[PDB]
């Protein structure tokens, strides 16, 4: 390990990798592992130079907590998702709470349920249960031991909206109600100044009382006095009502207190902004043809806010986009939340790394015969791209 060891493959046990990554492999690596005929063969991942720069930052961040260390997430733009197969397993081995989500779009382009509400945020009861069930597979034994704060008890609505933001939707309804009821006091001049001021004072008294009686938020009365954060089993029991309120409660809880280092990795982040496959009546004439934007849903919105990374006093977030699901085009980075100083633009594989990749497949009995004479010839054909290299060599005998 170090600068001297760049572009090498690290062996991984088949059984150990599954336990460390219960959800699955990071990226499209599952398509390349099935090609190996041997079932007992190990899995190798190349150590690109982009991982060395990122790994060093995490080392200093852990030592400080025991303004020099970074306190914001990064962004990989341009093999951006290849590093995820080596950075996540390593961090998890160092007692780090890592949130794994390689396929966040599965909760937006599949069979589900939507229920409109006054808050204007659609919820998914069916997909809300799968988020916590998959996260607890490997992150267990730590959430239960972690305590729970008392300053963030129950200030979230059913759809995960804050109390202050949820009650604002009813401001218009209450505004007209008070205007019609003012005739009782308006109809009983005196100095032309105090008479008008006294009438206005009645509005303040009535508004204060109206903002605390009509609204009846649900303060998770099912659990009066919690003791931990992993002891919330009632969320898994009830799904029709208590599906989204508990999802946001854990999200807010992991910002205030600081006991353990955390990490969040969201892959394929370029397919969360575009429109979803849902249909509704929220279109702005011809903007969506009657479709629900992906960022307007509950689950996608939770992982579609990079400007909030500052509140993460425990850790930080990270995302990468390399697939061809949508044309990147200009891909404005300034109007999204990230800055120009936090974008890691990787490049194509160097000739040195290209040779190692070809030799790696030989040990796996993937290719038939790859003469050294044509080793450099194939570099110009595919251009050294990883996607074009594996596909070109797979179709043909290779070399």
């Amino acid at each position: 390990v170090g600068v001297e060891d760049v572009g090498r493959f690290r062996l991984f046990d088949r059984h150990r990798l599954v336990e460390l990554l219960p959800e699955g492999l990071a990226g499209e690596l599952s398509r390349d592992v099935e090609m190996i005929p041997s079932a007992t063969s190990p899995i190798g991942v190349m150590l690109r130079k982009a991982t060395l720069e990122l790994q060093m930052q995490l080392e200093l961040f852990a030592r400080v907590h025991a303004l020099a260390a970074v306190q914001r997430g990064f962004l990989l733009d341009g093999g951006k998702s290849c590093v995820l197969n080596y950075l996540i397993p390593w961090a998890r081995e160092n007692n780090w709470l890592v949130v794994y989500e390689p396929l966040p779009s599965r909760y937006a382009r599949e069979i589900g349920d939507i229920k409109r509400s006054s808050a204007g945020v659609y919820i998914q009861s069916s997909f809300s249960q799968e988020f916590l069930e998959r996260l607890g597979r490997f992150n267990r034994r730590l959430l239960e031991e972690l305590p729970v704060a008392r300053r963030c008890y129950g200030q979230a609505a059913l759809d995960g909206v804050h109390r202050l933001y949820a009650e604002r939707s009813y401001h218009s309804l209450l505004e007209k109600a008070l205007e019609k009821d003012l005739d009782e006091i308006r109809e009983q001049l005196d100095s032309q100044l105090r008479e008008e001021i006294l009438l206005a004072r009645e509005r303040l008294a009535l508004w204060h009382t109206y903002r605390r009686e009509v609204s009846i938020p649900s303060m998770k009365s099912r659990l009066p006095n919690p003791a931990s954060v992993w002891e919330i089993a009632e969320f898994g029991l009830q799904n029709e009502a208590f599906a989204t309120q508990a999802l946001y409660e854990v999200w807010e809880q992991l910002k205030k207190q600081t006991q353990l280092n955390v990490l969040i990795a969201v892959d394929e982040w370029n397919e969360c902004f575009p429109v979803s496959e849902y249909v509704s009546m929220r279109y702005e004439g011809t903007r969506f043809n009657g479709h629900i934007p992906a960022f307007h849903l509950s689950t996608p919105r939770l992982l579609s806010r990079f400007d909030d990374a500052q509140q993460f006093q425990r850790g930080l977030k990270i995302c990468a986009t390399s697939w061809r699901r949508s044309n990147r085009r200009d891909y404005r980075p300034d109007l999204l939340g990230v800055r120009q100083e936090e974008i890691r633009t990787v490049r194509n594989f160097s000739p040195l790394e290209f040779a190692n990749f070809v030799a790696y497949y030989h040990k796996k009995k993937i290719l038939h015969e790859f003469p050294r004479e044509k080793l450099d010839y194939f570099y110009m054909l595919s251009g050294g791209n990883g996607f074009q290299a594996r596909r070109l060599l797979a179709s043909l005998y290779g070399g």
Partner: protein, 189 residues
């Protein structure tokens, strides 16, 4: 060639005789060969200079054990040309059209151009198609790798003289730029 570029560069460093015109040219050779496929497997260069050297494995490990004093040269390399005079000298309009092709009366095409093509062995005149030159990394790819070495040589409690080279690389203004958020972190450490 690759076998003679490093020797020339190394000699200048010892004698403290650099060139602002020759340095950029020799920097490309050291980069293309460094990342070549035959780096670790290839044996030594045949000049006997490498026989009595601490490092080995041809250029693979030779540059890895390079003194930190000489490593700063690659990072702190001036790529400016002679035309650069808009900073201290004054105003200067640079040209962008050296060639000025003008016809004359003695070398003018005849009116009947149809028969002219039939009096040639092969096609000569063709539509205007010219390919431009695209600048490569120009040695910046190798410089980025060298910058990471100085970061690790800070928390080792080394000599003061050896630590001066780290600051010079971190204080660059035309190569490192601000792509990654590592400059303030390295400086703070």
């Amino acid at each position: 060639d690759h076998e003679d570029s490093f020797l020339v560069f190394y000699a200048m460093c010892s004698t403290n005789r650099f060139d602002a015109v020759l340095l950029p040219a020799l920097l490309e050779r050291l980069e293309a060969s460094f990342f070549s496929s035959q780096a670790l497997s290839k044996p030594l260069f045949h000049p006997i200079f490498e026989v009595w050297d601490p490092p080995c494995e041809s250029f693979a490990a030779l540059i890895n054990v390079l003194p930190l004093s000489a490593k700063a040269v690659v990072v702190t390399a001036d790529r400016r040309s002679e035309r650069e005079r808009r900073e201290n000298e004054g105003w200067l309009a640079p040209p962008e059209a050296p060639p000025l092709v003008l016809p004359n009366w003695q070398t003018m095409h005849p009116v009947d151009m149809e028969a002219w093509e039939k009096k040639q062995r092969r096609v000569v005149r063709t539509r205007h198609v010219k390919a431009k030159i695209i600048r490569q990394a120009d040695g910046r790819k190798l410089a980025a790798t060298m910058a990471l070495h100085g970061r690790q040589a800070i928390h080792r409690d080394a000599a003061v003289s050896s630590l001066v080279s780290v600051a010079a690389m971190c204080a660059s203004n035309s190569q490192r730029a601000l792509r990654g958020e590592l400059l303030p972190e390295t400086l703070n450490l």
